[PDB]
Amino acid sequence: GAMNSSNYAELFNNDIKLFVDDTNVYRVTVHKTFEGNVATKAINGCIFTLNPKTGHLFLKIIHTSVWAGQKRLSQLAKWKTAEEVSALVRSLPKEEQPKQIIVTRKAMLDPLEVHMLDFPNIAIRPTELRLPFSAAMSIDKLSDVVMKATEPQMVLFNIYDDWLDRISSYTAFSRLTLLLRALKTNEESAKMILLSDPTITIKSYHLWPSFTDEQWITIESQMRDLILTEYGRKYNV
Amino acid sequence: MNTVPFTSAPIEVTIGIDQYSFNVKENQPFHGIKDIPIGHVHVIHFQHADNSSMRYGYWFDCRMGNFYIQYDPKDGLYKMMEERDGAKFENIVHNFKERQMMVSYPKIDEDDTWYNLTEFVQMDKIRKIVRKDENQFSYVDSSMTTVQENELSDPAHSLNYTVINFKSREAIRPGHEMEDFLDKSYYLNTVMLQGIFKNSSNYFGELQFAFLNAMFFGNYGSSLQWHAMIELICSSATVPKHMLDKLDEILYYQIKTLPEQYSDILLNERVWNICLYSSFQKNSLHNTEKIMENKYPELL
Ligand SMILES: CN(C)C(=O)Oc1cccc(N)c1
Numbered sequence: 062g063a064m065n066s067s068n069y070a071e072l073f074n075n076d077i078k079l080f081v082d083d084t085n086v087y088r089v090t091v092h093k094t095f096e097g098n099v100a101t102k103a104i105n106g107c108i109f110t111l112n113p114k115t116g117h118l119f120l121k122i123i124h125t126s127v128w129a130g131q132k133r134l135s136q137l138a139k140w141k142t143a144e145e146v147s148a149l150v151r152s153l154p155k156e157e158q159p160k161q162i163i164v165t166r167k168a169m170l171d172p173l174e175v176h177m178l179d180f181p182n183i184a185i186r187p188t189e190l191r192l193p194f195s196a197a198m199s200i201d202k203l204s205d206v207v208m209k210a211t212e213p214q215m216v217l218f219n220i221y222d223d224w225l226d227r228i229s230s231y232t233a234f235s236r237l238t239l240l241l242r243a244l245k246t247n248e249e250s251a252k253m254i255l256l257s258d259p260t261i262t263i264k265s266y267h268l269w270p271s272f273t274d275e276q277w278i279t280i281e282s283q284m285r286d287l288i289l290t291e292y293g294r295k296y297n298v
Numbered sequence: 299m300n301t302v303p304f305t306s307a308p309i310e311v312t313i314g315i316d317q318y319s320f321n322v323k324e325n326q327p328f329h330g331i332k333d334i335p336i337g338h339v340h341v342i343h344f345q346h347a348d349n350s351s352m353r354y355g356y357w358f359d360c361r362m363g364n365f366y367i368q369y370d371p372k373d374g375l376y377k378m379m380e381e382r383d384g385a386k387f388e389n390i391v392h393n394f395k396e397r398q399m400m401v402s403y404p405k406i407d408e409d410d411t412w413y414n415l416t417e418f419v420q421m422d423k424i425r426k427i428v429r430k431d432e433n434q435f436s437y438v439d440s441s442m443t444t445v446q447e448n449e450l451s452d453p454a455h456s457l458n459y460t461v462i463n464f465k466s467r468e469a470i471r472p473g474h475e476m477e478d479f480l481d482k483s484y485y486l487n488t489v490m491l492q493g494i495f496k497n498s499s500n501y502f503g504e505l506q507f508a509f510l511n512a513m514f515f516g517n518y519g520s521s522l523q524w525h526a527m528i529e530l531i532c533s534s535a536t537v538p539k540h541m542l543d544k545l546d547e548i549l550y551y552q553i554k555t556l557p558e559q560y561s562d563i564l565l566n567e568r569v570w571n572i573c574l575y576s577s578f579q580k581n582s583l584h585n586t587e588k589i590m591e592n593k594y595p596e597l598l
């Protein structure tokens with residue numbers, strides 16, 4: 062069934078599961094033509110496929126060539142997503158395949174379900190949560206492997222860096238969702254919180270700074286302030 | 299013109315014969331129905347006055363035998379039976395006609411309704427959907443479930459309609475997932491028409507039979523089947539032109555005949571709005587769209 066606040070701890074049990082977000086698969090800039098009409102130019106996108114218990118991110122880069130000569134691209138994007146997720150599952154050993162796939166948008170249910178007909182024991186589920194996964198693409202290093210791609214490519218990351226050595230996956234997911242909510246609502250003022258201090262740096266092999274435990278509390282506190290504010294600046298309260 | 303005599307009418311019952319119906323009182327001197335047109339299947343159906351629960355009835359074709367009705371007080375229903383003794387039957391009927399104890403199948407001469415509702419329905423195909431091979435006629439009632447319903451429980455008492463499922467390996471060619479799901483022509487023309495039904499007449503016959511069981515018995519699984527068979531054609535970009543023209547005629551007469559007060563349960567809003575306004579064939583059902591818009595504009 063649908064995933065919501067009530068069954069949130071299920072994300073961190075020992076049944077393998079993947080979130081799939083398709084927001085950033087088909088991406089365009091809209092511009093004027095010489096004749097004064099409007100046209101779109103596509104840019105590279107990505108499927109965001111995340112194991113919330115381990116932090117294992119399978120980032121399938123979608124190169125603009127996959128749209129050449131195709132119609133109804135927003136619709137095709139959902140089926141392309143489902144085809145790539147299906148290909149990913151088939152590439153994994155049986156004992157690594159997910160028992161559930163949770164899609165962040167309901168329009169992905171039927172495309173994924175049809176592509177996964179071969180896997181009747183994999184549950185395809187929606188969610189009621191408003192998860193902020195589009196916001197990975199605002200992390201410069203992520204903006205860059207996607208934008209630099211010249212061909213289809215799968216890039217493998219742990220989105221939690223080394224956090225699981227010190228915190229649980231519940232706490233790591235909550236940190237991730239807070240950072241991404243923050244990186245959604247106001248990219249610039251949330252970009253200052255993470256690296257406006259020049260002594261905390263990211264390891265070459267990571268997406269987030271090496272904050273200490275105490276610095277993470279400060280950082281997390283600053284992100285919640287941002288989110289509350291912008292919610293005022295937005296609604297005037 | 300043939301006759302279905304009744305031994306008696308011991309319980310008050312509304313009797314249907316095709317799209318006609320009449321009331322019979324407890325122990326009324328009623329001995330059957332005469333002047334039944336040859337050349338068509340027919341259905342004779344029952345709703346007891348005391349228990350509107352369970353509409354039930356029998357599909358039959360008088361060319362296949364001499365059939366009569368007899369109330370069974372143990373099982374509590376009117377049962378169809380075959381009389382194998384031809385001269386016994388003729389003598390029974392002639393006596394009942396002489397005493398004018400039979401109602402006349404009341405067909406208006408201009409009226410093609412029943413032909414139009416049963417054009418492609420054959421008894422031999424009914425008997426494969428309703429399996430009871432010791433009889434030449436077929437029992438159906440409001441509660442019988444379909445094979446597909448059982449998969450989602452008594453196999454002997456099921457309606458064995460052709461299983462249609464748009465999200466199934468039969469419907470979806472590996473590697474044509476998006477193509478086959480958004481344009482069901484493969485599934486309609488290759489899997490179902492060429493593979494399973496053999497021709498469109500058998501397809502239309504099952505569609506018509508499913509509608510009639512939905513209308514006369516309120517059989518929910520039959521209504522599901524009728525809508526699924528409509529949707530499979532409407533959701534196909536490539537349909538033979540003769541099939542579309544015949545479908546429009548079929549549906550038109552079904553909508554024409556439907557009780558105005560049953561449209562709330564017998565018509566699926568989603569299927570009809572999709573078929574008439576969003577599907578590949580949205581512009582191919584002129585007669586059906588005009589009668590639906592003038593008779594059930596609320597649904598749409
Ligand atoms: C190239 N750099 C240092 C980079 O990716 O900057 C960010 C921006 C936003 C979030 C994070 N974690 C890092």
Ligand SMILES: CN(C)C(=O)Oc1cccc(N)c1
Pocket residue numbers: 117118119217218219
């Ligand atoms: C199978 N993938 C998701 C995977 O191994 O992801 C990682 C995990 C940790 C570090 C790195 N570099 C990549």
